[PDB]
Amino acid sequence: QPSTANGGFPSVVVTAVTATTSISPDIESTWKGLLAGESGIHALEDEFVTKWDLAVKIGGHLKDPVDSHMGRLDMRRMSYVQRMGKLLGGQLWESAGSPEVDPDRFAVVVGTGLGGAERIVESYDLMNAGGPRKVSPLAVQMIMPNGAAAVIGLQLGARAGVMTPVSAQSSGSEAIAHAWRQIVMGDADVAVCGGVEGPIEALPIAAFSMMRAMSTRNDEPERASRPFDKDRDGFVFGEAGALMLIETEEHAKARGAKPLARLLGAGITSDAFHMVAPAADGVRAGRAMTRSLELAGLSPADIDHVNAHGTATPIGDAAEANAIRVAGCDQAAVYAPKSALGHSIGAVGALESVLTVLTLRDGVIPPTLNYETPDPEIDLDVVAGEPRYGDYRYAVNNSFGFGGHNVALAFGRY
Amino acid sequence: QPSTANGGFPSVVVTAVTATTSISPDIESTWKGLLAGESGIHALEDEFVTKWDLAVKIGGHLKDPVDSHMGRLDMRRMSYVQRMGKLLGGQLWESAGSPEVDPDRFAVVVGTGLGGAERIVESYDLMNAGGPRKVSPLAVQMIMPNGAAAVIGLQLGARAGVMTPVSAQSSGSEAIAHAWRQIVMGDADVAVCGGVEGPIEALPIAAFSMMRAMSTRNDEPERASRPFDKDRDGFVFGEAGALMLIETEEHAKARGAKPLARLLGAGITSDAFHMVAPAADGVRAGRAMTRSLELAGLSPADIDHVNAHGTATPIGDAAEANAIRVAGCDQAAVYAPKSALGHSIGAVGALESVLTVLTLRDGVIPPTLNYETPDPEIDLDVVAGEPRYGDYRYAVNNSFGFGGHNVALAFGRY
Ligand SMILES: CCCCCCCCCCCCCCCC(=O)O[C@H](COC(=O)CCCCCCCC[C@H](C)CCCCCCCC)COP(=O)(O)O
Ligand SMILES: CCCCCCCCCCCCCCCC(=O)O[C@H](COC(=O)CCCCCCCC[C@H](C)CCCCCCCC)COP(=O)(O)O
Ligand SMILES: C=C/C(C)=C/[C@@]1(C)SC(=O)C(CC)=C1O
Ligand SMILES: C=C/C(C)=C/[C@@]1(C)SC(=O)C(CC)=C1O
Numbered sequence A, B: 001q002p003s004t005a006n007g008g009f010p011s012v013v014v015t016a017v018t019a020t021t022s023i024s025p026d027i028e029s030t031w032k033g034l035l036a037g038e039s040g041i042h043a044l045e046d047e048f049v050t051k052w053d054l055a056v057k058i059g060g061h062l063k064d065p066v067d068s069h070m071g072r073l074d075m076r077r078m079s080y081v082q083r084m085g086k087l088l089g090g091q092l093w094e095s096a097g098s099p100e101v102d103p104d105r106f107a108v109v110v111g112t113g114l115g116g117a118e119r120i121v122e123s124y125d126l127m128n129a130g131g132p133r134k135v136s137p138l139a140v141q142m143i144m145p146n147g148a149a150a151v152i153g154l155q156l157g158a159r160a161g162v163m164t165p166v167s168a169q170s171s172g173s174e175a176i177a178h179a180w181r182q183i184v185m186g187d188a189d190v191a192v193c194g195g196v197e198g199p200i201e202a203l204p205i206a207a208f209s210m211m212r213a214m215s216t217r218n219d220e221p222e223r224a225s226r227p228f229d230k231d232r233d234g235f236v237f238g239e240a241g242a243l244m245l246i247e248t249e250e251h252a253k254a255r256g257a258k259p260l261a262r263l264l265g266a267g268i269t270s271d272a273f274h275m276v277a278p279a280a281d282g283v284r285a286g287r288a289m290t291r292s293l294e295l296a297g298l299s300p301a302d303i304d305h306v307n308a309h310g311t312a313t314p315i316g317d318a319a320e321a322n323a324i325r326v327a328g329c330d331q332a333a334v335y336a337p338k339s340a341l342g343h344s345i346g347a348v349g350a351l352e353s354v355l356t357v358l359t360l361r362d363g364v365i366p367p368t369l370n371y372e373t374p375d376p377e378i379d380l381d382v383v384a385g386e387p388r389y390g391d392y393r394y395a396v397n398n399s400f401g402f403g404g405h406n407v408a409l410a411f412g413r414y
């Protein structure tokens, strides 16, 4: 059976990354910030918080708002996720050296949680006020959830497929999994992949808050997200979008690109347990990890590092600790970046895959913030207090989503 | 290089199909109907048409509304596409003999155009009227576009992955493409796949009609949808959802299921041309067809039948005829089912895949309705007037979507 290690699949490398976060618009500054123990979570100053007296009054807005880079027409012709996709798509390509690739071998796979939903409600209000001729001729193509991926495909010229897998909070990792599949199956040699997501707003907070699993530690925003900690009280929103460029090792060599890491395998499963709670036993989630190992050609003892989904929900963290044990990876050093960056939903799995890549490139895992009281039921090696340094050779990035979706990505040091 | 024909991919068979359409809730009755020249397209009698004086006053509502089957609890706690998913998934599973499969080898892949969007505008109105605590605690899990796929995965017990590819009008076929990939790569032995979509409503009609591509032949509804006809004047909505059950031929034989057809190969590409117009040259669209043949182990000369996306827009049908030529498939017999069933957006490529399968099972292509004046730019063998019987062995189903997505599926007689 084919694996990366046994040459049954071609070698695929990560050759550029871009991300915008609550800490910085520059991924390399976000990364230094994380290492120095910086949090992007703050008191929400938005008017909408006082207008509605929201129970949740914390979150990380992007340091550098997407729309400060958007012109007059982009504001009127794209939904917010498409605007983010355009912004990141251009930054990534510039970071890659603006390569001239064969368009017929270039694919885009970009996940998102929802799509251009603000244009749904705008279109609804416009029609209710002034009838059907007040709806934009662009409303369909701004709203459709494949919109951000399609904007990036058009921007960069991708003709080997533009795909948008949606799996709620695992969408941004799932996208990279499908990009890797498309290359190893011979449909593409190069792919831009990742995840984008909307900003923090009143209605999203209201709707997630009614499920009662958001932190309300409003007095102390930077202490509120505590994945794996005994005193965790739910997740915190933190805005992000992130993309990476992956290509065959041969394609990278031929153009002189310097790889940051290798993308070795990907595992996708599903729980069939509950729509909005993960299976407590972590068995299908652990199988996604295992399947990424099988495809990579690795054993669980090879894994130095797991980048946890680690939302800081009580039931979420417990299930993931069980999954990591089921996969044999519970001696890896674990990071839960939502501790500092919060949860960006459809993008978050892409951001964390980027962080996994930087961990491998630089030999360092940032501290998990707020990890102050270990939880007996979670017996994991959670990195905390200061960075953990090592010559890491292999890591797995985990992401999970409402629906019972489990995605695991195996990366290696280049 | 592995193909189905050369045994490099495992054999994959279609063992059950279900669909609900404008003609019938029973796919076998829908099929008999199409063969008898029936149309599902009628005057819209909804009060919203006259309320808003909509330019488009025609379309095909389901013969049998999904909600005639829906418990009162479901009507509050699932979105419309989730209800459609649950209904179709239970029907499919019964049609299959309710098999006991290994859940850890069973995947679901179901596309849709948008998701539970009615719950977005419901949540918005509730919050505006009553504040943030009047939003449903189930709002998120009803809205998320992976919701329908996830309902089906929970309902049927799928633990090998639940996926929702979103590619607007090609989603339904793209879902079946990714299910075939998942089986041939060894991630699953059996999969439920296809597409669901919302109903014709006021805001959907306004937003699409403002793009200026819909038919407004309101005085003759059954004559409005005219794919490939010289006098075509745009597309017509017709509601549907459809699912099929695919599995390895070995798995089928083990349980004694008689196949309906073989699913031989799939190709996905993208245009990088325009967000809402297909590339005129048909080149990337023809490459998707060619890719499906390469993976099948077929040559264009083998192909007997093409089930065309055939929307009846002037530019869309012209581009598809060029793509069929690019692919070398322009000697095949062509059917354009939107002539009879109209356009079901995210569900349509799955519906048309099911029709392709029945064509191969029964050796007959239904007539393309309203095909009265050949267009010299098309120069295709369009089946029309009466059904055409023949010994069809191989067929390609086309679907394309806003964003420039091209999906082709290669099917074969069992
Ligand atoms: C990290 C946060 C993650 C967020 C959660 C993800 C949810 C998806 C986010 C959707 C995209 C939102 C885009 C907002 C653009 C923007 O900002 O529009 C403001 C003005 O507000 C609005 O129009 C708010 C309109 C909201 C649109 C409907 C959202 C409905 C959300 C659902 C009820 C709950 C969330 C469902 C998530 C399902 C999928 C993931 C599991 C500019 O203001 P002005 O400049 O005009 O003054
Ligand atoms: C032939 C298929 C047509 C496909 C069209 C696809 C459009 C997308 C699918 C939308 C799914 C909506 C489900 C409808 C539920 C239903 O019916 O609720 C009515 C009462 O009205 C409503 O609340 C309708 C309000 C709809 C609000 C959101 C619609 C947003 C539409 C966008 C602005 C334009 C379409 C975007 C498509 C992008 C994706 C594909 C390219 C019954 O009322 P009651 O009898 O129960 O009292
Ligand atoms: C099946 C449900 C799952 C996986 C739920 C998780 C663990 S995933 C996620 O991001 C969150 C917080 C938003 C959960 O509560
Ligand atoms: C890129 C745009 C494309 C492929 C557009 C097509 C041809 S596909 C489709 O179903 C329709 C009618 C709604 C189109 O107008």
Ligand SMILES: [K+]
Pocket (backbone or CB within 6 Å): A307, A308, A309, A310, A349, A352, A353, A397, A398, A399
């Ligand atoms: K992670």
Ligand SMILES: [K+]
Pocket (backbone or CB within 6 Å): B307, B308, B309, B310, B349, B352, B353, B397, B398, B399
């Ligand atoms: K078709």
